[PDB]
Amino acid sequence: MNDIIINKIATIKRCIKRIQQVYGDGSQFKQDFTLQDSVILNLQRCCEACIDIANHINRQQQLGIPQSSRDSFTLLAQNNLITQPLSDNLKKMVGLRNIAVHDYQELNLDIVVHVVQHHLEDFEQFIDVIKAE
């Protein structure tokens, strides 16, 4: 219990599994748009899933009404559910919904390489904190 969080937690794991597979060792990714388009898309599916889980937890425990997507992570940290360094990294991702719906290609390709290398483990961390229960 409940189904929508266990399905949103499951999707985050599915998208991480996909980003890890499509990106590969990182060689082909830099010069293949099909590899980039998939990783970018599966990256966006994680952000909206965490924002859904955050807005859900704030709702069920009446932690407040999140005015933004970033403010939803703030209420979790202000009630000490997540550490404040973990909220900042998840809020760093909230602004990652803009690499898509914008084909400004090379300007931020090195950035998606950064978040794939260094920031996928912030989603694994967030869902681990939810797992308790």
Partner: protein, 119 residues
């Protein structure tokens, strides 16, 4: 509600960028579009990390633009619609006459391409 957010968007860049030249508000007055010029180019990640730090200090998304590496068309959009927040005026004019003149030359280079696209 404004300005108190402006000097918020002043303290952060002035404290996070060595050799700050100018700071600009670009898009609208939600969504925030900020341009900046310095004596050195900004790192791709270190700028984005700062952009996300600006977006967290504020409530909206933030697009921080490095004017020492941005495209000529984007630079013209800043000198056309924009508001100087910090920096001198001789550096502002230096950057405008540079971009406008570079833009008049770019328009001459790509007009054959623009016309083919616009039928």
């Amino acid at each position: 509600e404004n300005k108190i957010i402006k000097l918020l968007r002043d303290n952060i860049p002035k404290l996070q960028l060595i050799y700050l030249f100018g700071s600009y508000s670009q898009g609208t007055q939600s969504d925030i579009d900020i341009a900046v010029l310095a004596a050195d180019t900004l790192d791709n990640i270190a700028r984005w990390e700062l952009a996300q730090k600006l977006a967290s200090a504020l409530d909206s998304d933030v697009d921080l633009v490095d004017l020492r590496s941005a495209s000529t068309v984007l630079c013209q959009q800043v000198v056309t619609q924009g508001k100087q927040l910090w920096g001198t005026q001789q550096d502002d004019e230096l950057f405008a006459v540079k971009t406008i003149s570079m833009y008049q030359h770019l328009q001459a280079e790509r007009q054959a391409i623009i016309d083919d696209v616009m039928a």
